[PDB]
Amino acid sequence: KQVKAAFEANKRVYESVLLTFKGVDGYDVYNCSVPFSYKGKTHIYGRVEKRDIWAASHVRLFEETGKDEFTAVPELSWELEDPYIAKINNEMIFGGTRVRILSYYGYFYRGTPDELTYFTRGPGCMKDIRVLQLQDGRLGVFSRPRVASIGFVILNSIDELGAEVIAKAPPLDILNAWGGVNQAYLLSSGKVGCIGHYSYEQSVYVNYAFVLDPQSRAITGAKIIGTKSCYPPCEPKVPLLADCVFASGIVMRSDGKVDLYSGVGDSHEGRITIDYPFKGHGTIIGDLHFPM
Asked: SS3 breakdown of the chain: % helix, strand, coil, rounded to 5?
């Protein structure tokens, strides 16, 4: 990518840190959910795995206990990779990758961050499936067939979410390379702000943003918003992923900037402070603050 080289040359980063995680000594923590809030505290789900082994993750819930410091909450876990969250009608829709290696699936749970109940899943051998609540209240769904396209279909509600409709979602004009939506946002324009990953063959993963018009299905404001060099130095899982970052999501800041959270090198979780990435397409509507 000439775009990547331009980005590296032109990047605009105001703060750059690696999260510190406690209560999981011995493990890597990476490809987190976007942070969220519950019972008065900032929380995050993380993918917890030993650095020297593959496909051996579980998910933990972490509570903020200091600036960019997160402590695991005792005795809660999920048998998944790459956790991800959304708010639909005042509740959490939590998901992760479930691995059988025979097969894998996007698994979906609903409830409170404390009480999540499995309810549905995507098609076999598909991951990187994401949702949000649209302006009019229906459900936007993003799919990710790879064997790669990013697809999108509007459904009536979470009750219609399942493997078939997911699979048949028509493609969007976004991606020999691949990628995914990691966190979708509703914008005051009615349009959809996505934060995700753009990937190509080093397996290069950069943090990526674009805006979707859920009706015309037009794609705008596409851009690189982060790379590996944006975050402090750290060893990847393997050398091959020395130029890999896998988006978690953004958090709106009161000074008008955003904090971008990302998996780093498949071994750490980073946060960089960057300019609002959906400039000109409106402000973000709603939040990831969950009622108990």
From this structure: 10, 50, 40
- Domains for the chain: give ranges and CATH numbers: 1-291 (2.115.10.20)
**Which experimental method was this entry solved with?**
X-ray
Q: Report the alpha-carbon distance of residue 219 to residue 191 in Å, rounded.
A: 10
Q: Which of 94, 77, 112, 102 is nearest to 161 (CA)?
A: 94
- Name 193's Cβ contacts closer than 8 Å, sequence gap at least 6: 184, 185, 186, 187, 209, 211, 277, 278, 281, 284
Amino acid at 152: F
Residue where the block lists tokens 């990518």? 1
Q: What resolution in angstrom units was achieved for this structure?
A: 2.0
233 CB contacts (<8 Å, ≥6 apart)?
none
Per the CB < 8 A criterion, the answer to whether 91 and 112 are in contact is: yes
